[PDB]
């Protein structure tokens, strides 16, 4: 119940965390955290605004050593990708991880899928799946005024 | 190999823009042709009296 | 191992002259000493392997989607490379079936455009039997490209479009029963078609230049 | 003088613009075929899967029973 | 619209009216499973109606997997007969259909975010826990799993009419949120 309340409060104040970021702190697994979250939302007769991909951008890119420019680039990529429906029905966290990966690979500071998965708590397979959907549309998602040393025109 | 991919997709967007412009042109041309048919029918109606 | 860089440099130095004559290519060959590219101690195996690689690269550059200037430059490159070989069994340029139509129409355009130098070079290559007419460009186991916008829209196309448009305006002016004003049933014509296509093309070229300009 | 001239000029204009539209649509079809080729490149895939048991099951992984020879 | 949900599962319960020795049924049945260290019921499977029955020592049997009410009733009667042939005084008392799970496809992608935004009091959309929107319909007590692919799964109904009316109520909302 305490873990569910903490998750609800974090979601409400506008700095939502992921269930995996509360499980890593609490002594229970994600399943019970989610069950108690739903039970509390049902009992309290309250609701929480749906999480957006931009909410996990700042924390994910601050845990990583990415600069602020790469953070803004990833946020813009993810927002445009969700607007363009390139990732239909996929969790916002996977989309955020894919945007962070592409922004890091295109920028001077490069990060592999493993580190991004550990930071965001997303399996590298999910990162690849969410990255291939937005792979062909890499350039138009980037900010127009974006400096880089590794061309956005070529990426893994 | 993303270089040719991006070149091709940008050409694709440009040519979709050209098709959109030409399709608007065609739609307005067809509307004009319908107006032509209507008014020529009306005008020719003045000499079968 | 750097052969592609040499080929690209030679093609760039040929195109910067904006010429199709074989004289410029011969002058560039003599100045760069490109004929010595095969010079150097190397046994027959690696020698013929390098010749195969050079011929394949030159043929690849000779085919689309490269510009006409680059294609003709690659044609002269193929001619020079094949004619100047250290291998007794001169290596042959691998020609695929799917690419034969493109090469034949390119030769037809070259001869039509009075570019007899390139046409004669290609004819000499064919007569000498320098082509291995394979099934695919490469054995299977286990830049200055050309854009579609120029094919779509160019000077002559837009000139014809605006001529048609102004003739259309004139016949509208003369059709109406009264010379003062045209009929109210025909006023939907758009004058921004030329402006719209100009905007699209200028945006496309702006994107192209800000792309090829590094950050 | 008579909108018939308007009709003739107009459908000839429609014919030329329709030829342009058809050419552009053929270019678009070629581009989309190229894109399909590229995705199948992304979805494409060895020699080792054949070596001794060229024919092999995808559920058990065993080839055909040995010939009488 | 003209599309209607197709029932995928029907869960029903019956009272056999006599206590059972699950060990004997497991040892003498044709397709029974009995693992007291994993569950406290005998799991029997049959082919003609393609249903699974859990038989409990108290005599209450739960039949699932049937695709129609008549099929579920026939399967339950088949299980009752099978238990009867094993030397038990099993009858067919208090047959009740407890759940009706059906699936359908509206055949157009749906914007779940907008749906949850405008139906916050009913829908619960948590992409982290489940990639589908859970809509708790109130007029009939039915729960709808609605996915971006357009597939809609209705569950929790006791009658087919409940599922049909729930889908009729939900279809306009999905059409209004047609992605």
Do B18 and D24 make contact, defined as CB atoms within 8 angstroms? yes
- Give the residue among C14, C165, C145, C172 at the shortest CA–CA distance from C78: C14
**Measured between CA atoms, how close is D6 to chain C, in angstroms?**
7
Do C189 and B24 make contact, defined as CB atoms within 8 angstroms? no
Helix (H) or strand (E) segment spanning residue E144: strand E142-146
* CA gap A129, C152 in Å, rounded: 37
Strand stretches in chain C, DSSP E: 93-95, 131-133
Q: Output the six-digit token pair for C94.
A: 């691998």
Q: Is D43 on the interface with A (CB under 8 A)?
A: no
- Give the residue among C82, C99, C75 at the shortest CA–CA distance from C20: C75
- Give the residue among A145, A57, A71 at the shortest CA–CA distance from A104: A71
C-chain residues near B31 (CB < 8 A) = 188
Q: Taking a C-beta distance cutoff of 8 angstroms, is the pair B47, D32 a contact? A: no
* CA gap C110, B13 in Å, rounded: 32
As for chain E, the residues directly before each break of C–N over 2.5 Å are: none
Question: Using omega within 30 degrees of 0 as the cis cutoff, is the peptide bond preceding E115 cis?
Answer: no
Q: Output the six-digit token pair for E65.
A: 């997997």
Unique residue bearing structure tokens 């009992």: A43
**Measured between CA atoms, how close is A98 to chain C, in angstroms?**
23
Q: Taking a C-beta distance cutoff of 8 angstroms, is the pair C50, C40 a contact? A: no
Domains of chain E: 1-11+98-179 (3.30.310.10), 12-97 (3.30.310.10)
What is the longest distance spanned by two Cα atoms in chain B?
73
CATH number for A122: 1.10.472.10
Number of other CB atoms surrounding residue E28 within 10 Å: 12
What residue numbers of E does the annotated binding site for DNA cover?
A: 9, 45, 60, 99, 136
- Structure solved via: cryo-EM
B-chain residues near D25 (CB < 8 A) = 19
Chains that touch E (3 or more CB pairs under 8 A): A
* CA gap C37, C130 in Å, rounded: 19
Phi, psi (degrees; rounded to nearest 5) at A73:
-60, -45
Q: Taking a C-beta distance cutoff of 8 angstroms, is the pair E77, E111 a contact? A: no
Do C186 and B36 make contact, defined as CB atoms within 8 angstroms? yes
Q: How far is CA E36 from the centre of its chain?
A: 24
Helix orientation angle between A68-83 and A92-106, rounded to the nearest 10 degrees: 130
Number of other CB atoms surrounding residue E145 within 10 Å: 17
Chains that touch D (3 or more CB pairs under 8 A): A, B, C
Chains B and E touch (3+ CB pairs under 8 A): no
Tell me whether residue C36 is exposed, middle or buried, using C-beta atoms within 10 angstroms of its C-beta: 0 to 12, 13 to 18, 19 or more: exposed
Strand stretches in C13-138, DSSP E: 93-95, 131-133
Domain that holds residue A87: 48-155
Rg value, chain B, Cα: 21
Phi, psi (degrees; rounded to nearest 5) at C131:
-115, 125
Unique residue bearing structure tokens 């996915």: E147
Unique residue bearing structure tokens 């007419």: C133
Q: Taking a C-beta distance cutoff of 8 angstroms, is the pair A73, A143 a contact? A: yes
Q: Taking a C-beta distance cutoff of 8 angstroms, is the pair C69, C18 a contact? A: yes
**Measured between CA atoms, how close is D46 to chain C, in angstroms?**
6
Q: Taking a C-beta distance cutoff of 8 angstroms, is the pair E91, E47 a contact? A: no
Q: Is B33 on the interface with C (CB under 8 A)?
A: no
Do A136 and B9 make contact, defined as CB atoms within 8 angstroms? yes
With left for phi above 0 and alpha for psi between -120 and 50, is residue C18 left, alpha or beta?
left
Beta bridge partners of E10: E100
- Give the residue among E102, E103, E99, E104 at the shortest CA–CA distance from E157: E99
Q: Is A152 on the interface with C (CB under 8 A)?
A: no
**Measured between CA atoms, how close is B27 to chain A, in angstroms?**
28
**Measured between CA atoms, how close is B49 to chain D, in angstroms?**
19
* CA gap C39, C86 in Å, rounded: 8
Q: Is E178 on the interface with A (CB under 8 A)?
A: no
Interface of C with A (CB under 8 A): 211, 215
- Give the residue among E99, E107, E105 at the shortest CA–CA distance from E156: E99
Q: Output the six-digit token pair for A150.
A: 């590794």
Residue of C nearest to B8 (CA): C147
Chains that touch C (3 or more CB pairs under 8 A): A, B, D
B-chain residues near C66 (CB < 8 A) = none
- Give the residue among E34, E16, E15 at the shortest CA–CA distance from E24: E34
Chains that touch A (3 or more CB pairs under 8 A): B, C, D, E
C-chain residues near D21 (CB < 8 A) = none
Cα-Cα-Cα-Cα dihedral of E116, E119, E124, E130, to 10°? -40
Do A154 and B2 make contact, defined as CB atoms within 8 angstroms? yes
Q: How many CB pairs under 8 A join A and B?
A: 14
Q: Taking a C-beta distance cutoff of 8 angstroms, is the pair A121, A93 a contact? A: yes
Residue of A nearest to B1 (CA): A154
Measured CA to CA in angstroms, residue A151 lies from A112, A116, A143, C214 at distances of 17, 21, 13, 9
Rg value, chain D, Cα: 29
D-chain residues near A135 (CB < 8 A) = 42
Resolution in A: 3.4
Number of other CB atoms surrounding residue A140 within 10 Å: 15
What residue numbers of E does the annotated binding site cover?
A: 9, 45, 60, 99, 136
Q: Output the six-digit token pair for B36.
A: 């032509």
Chains D and C touch (3+ CB pairs under 8 A): yes
What residue numbers of A does the annotated binding site for DNA cover?
A: 31, 38, 90, 114, 123, 126, 128, 132
D-chain residues near B8 (CB < 8 A) = 31, 34-35
* CA gap C145, C118 in Å, rounded: 20
Q: Output the six-digit token pair for C194.
A: 């030329």
């Amino acid at each position: 119940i305490a873990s569910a309340c903490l998750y609800i409060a974090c979601r409400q104040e506008g700095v939502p965390r992921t269930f995996k970021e509360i499980c890593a702190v609490s002594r229970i697994s994600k399943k019970e955290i989610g069950r108690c979250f739903k039970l509390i939302l049902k009992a309290l007769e309250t609701s929480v605004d749906l999480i957006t991909t931009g909410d996990f951008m700042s924390r994910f890119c601050s845990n990583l050593c990415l600069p602020k420019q790469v953070q803004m680039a990833a946020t813009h990529i993810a927002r445009k990708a969700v607007e363009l429906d390139l990732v239909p029905g996929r969790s916002p966290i996977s989309v955020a991880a894919a945007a962070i990966y592409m922004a890091s690979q295109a920028s001077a500071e490069k990060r592999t899928q493993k580190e991004i998965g550990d930071i965001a708590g997303v399996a590298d397979v999910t990162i690849r799946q969410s990255y291939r959907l937005i792979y062909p549309r890499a350039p138009d998602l980037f900010p127009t005024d974006f400096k880089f040393d590794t061309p956005v025109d070529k990426l893994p | 190999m993303l270089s040719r991919l991006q070149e091709l997709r940008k050409e694709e967007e440009t040519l979709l823009r050209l098709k959109a412009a030409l399709h608007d042109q065609l739609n307005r041309l067809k509307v004009e042709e319908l107006a032509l048919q209507s008014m020529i029918s009306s005008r020719r109606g003045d000499e079968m009296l | 191992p750097g052969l592609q860089t040499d080929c690209e440099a030679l093609l760039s130095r040929f195109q910067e002259t904006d010429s199709v004559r074989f004289e410029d290519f011969t002058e560039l060959w003599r100045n760069m000493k490109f004929g010595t590219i095969f010079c150097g101690r190397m046994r027959n195996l690696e020698k013929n392997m390098f010749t195969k690689e050079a011929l394949a690269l030159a043929w690849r550059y000779f085919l689309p989607p490269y510009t006409f200037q680059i294609r003709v430059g690659a044609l002269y490159l193929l001619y020079g490379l094949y004619n100047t070989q250290l291998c007794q069994p001169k290596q042959k340029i691998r020609v695929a079936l799917k690419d034969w139509d493109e090469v034949l129409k390119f030769q037809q355009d070259l001869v039509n455009a009075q570019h007899f130098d390139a046409a004669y070079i290609f004819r000499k290559l064919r007569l000498d039997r320098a082509f291995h007419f394979t099934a695919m460009p490469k054995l299977l186991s286990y830049k200055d490209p050309s854009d579609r916008v120029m094919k779509l829209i160019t000077s002559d196309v837009l000139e014809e479009m605006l001529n048609v448009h102004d003739h259309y305006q004139n016949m509208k002016h003369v059709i109406s029963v009264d010379k003062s004003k045209p009929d109210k049933a025909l006023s939907l014509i758009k004058d921004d078609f030329f402006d719209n296509i100009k905007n699209i093309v200028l945006e496309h070229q702006q994107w192209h230049k800000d792309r090829k300009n590094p950050s | 003088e008579d909108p018939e001239t308007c009709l003739q000029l107009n459908m000839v204009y429609q014919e030329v613009i329709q030829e342009k539209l058809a050419e552009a649509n053929l270019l678009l079809a070629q581009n989309r075929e190229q894109q399909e080729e590229l995705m199948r490149d992304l979805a494409g895939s060895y020699m080792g899967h054949f070596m001794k048991p060229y024919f092999k099951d995808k559920v058990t992984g065993v080839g055909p029973p040995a010939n009488e020879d | 619209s003209g599309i209607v949900p197709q029932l995928q599962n029907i869960v029903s319960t019956v009272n056999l009216g006599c206590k059972l020795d699950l060990k004997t049924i497991a040892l003498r049945a044709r397709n029974a499973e009995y693992n007291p260290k994993r569950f406290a019921a005998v799991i029997m499977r049959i082919r003609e109606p393609r249903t699974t029955a859990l038989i409990f020592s108290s005599g209450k049997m739960v039949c699932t997997g049937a695709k129609s009410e008549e099929q579920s009733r026939l399967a339950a009667r088949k299980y009752a007969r099978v238990v009867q042939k094993l030397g038990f005084p099993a009858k067919f008392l208090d047959f009740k259909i407890q759940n009706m799970v059906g699936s359908c496809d509206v055949k157009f992608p749906i914007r779940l975010e907008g749906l949850v935004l405008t139906h916050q009091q009913f829908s619960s959309y948590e992409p982290e826990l489940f990639p589908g929107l859970i809509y708790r319909m109130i007029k009939p007590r039915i729960v709808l799993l609605i996915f971006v692919s357009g597939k809609v799964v209705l569950t929790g109904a006791k009658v087919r009419a409940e599922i049909y009316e729930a889908f009729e109520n939900i279809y306009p909302i999905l059409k209004g949120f047609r992605k």
